Ligand binder design. Sequence first.
Ligand SMILES: Nc1ncnc2c1ncn2[C@@H]1O[C@H](COP(=O)(O)OP(=O)(O)O)[C@@H](O)[C@H]1O
Ligand SMILES: [Mg+2]
Length: 307
Amino acid sequence: AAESVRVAVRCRPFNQREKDLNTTLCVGMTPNVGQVNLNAPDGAAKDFTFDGAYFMDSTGEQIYNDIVFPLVENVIEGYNGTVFAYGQTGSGKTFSMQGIETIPAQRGVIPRAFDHIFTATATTENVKFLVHCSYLEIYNEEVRDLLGADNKQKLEIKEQGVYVAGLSMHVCHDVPACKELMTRGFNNRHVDSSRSHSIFTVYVEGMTETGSIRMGKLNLVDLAGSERKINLSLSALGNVISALVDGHIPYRDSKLTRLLQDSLGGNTKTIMIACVSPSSDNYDETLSTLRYANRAKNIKNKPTINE
Ligand SMILES: Nc1ncnc2c1ncn2[C@@H]1O[C@H](COP(=O)(O)OP(=O)(O)O)[C@@H](O)[C@H]1O
Ligand SMILES: [Mg+2]
């Protein structure tokens, strides 16, 4: 079925220095209708409509429940699903994807997708599920396996769909197995993470009582900071989105757009979490993220059940 990319905006709270400077709040929201207003110094507001609008006190729990939970349900049924985190360095991309364990309601979409997948796969008595994970990093157009034996090894992108040749896949029989791969991946990151893209993939294979196998993959992507060969994957993402909404798509311009070409206009249900700052000192970057997120709503995907 024809389905548009769902876009949600998340505004982080002020940090300590912003409070010490008494920094002006230039972001407003009307979460019932997904409205985000951005105020300029002169007083003129710029208004945007999104599929979700999560303000300074929002939690990873309420973001997951409203926006990601139905996509993860679809992955279990056999669909491909992708969640990207987009925004400047310091806006909350990693806090939205990974989150924190010190405050349970602030746990990210990745730990939450693990709990959801292992709960839902066990409560479906008709289907037997096998879960596998992969975790890669793209820095300077160099693709690296974050869980492999040699993490330094640069890997090639080939097509059979599109895949990373030599990318290790790790069986996960439960949530602890999943969380060990997350910390393992973190300790193997390039030396900090602001200029690279990371992709955590969860493969959910379901075997029915008949014997029919369905295969849905979940891509959880933490993009490099959008602040204005290092910036090629980000520039190509913008160029791809422009072609997709402008009515040829240059997926091959970068490693990131080649790998995720099915997430942008292909067989996948995609969600974009655009992260913004509440501060008037970040106005220019926030306006850039909001315009990018607004444009991203017009991308048309064609997700079908992989069975
Ligand atoms: N919603 C939030 N609530 C509390 N702290 C947050 C929130 N979003 C981000 N932070 C804090 O802001 C800082 C930067 O966030 P981070 O996720 O690392 O951003 P990014 O990955 O986009 O560079 C961190 O110190 C993090 O704890
Ligand atoms: Mg980060």
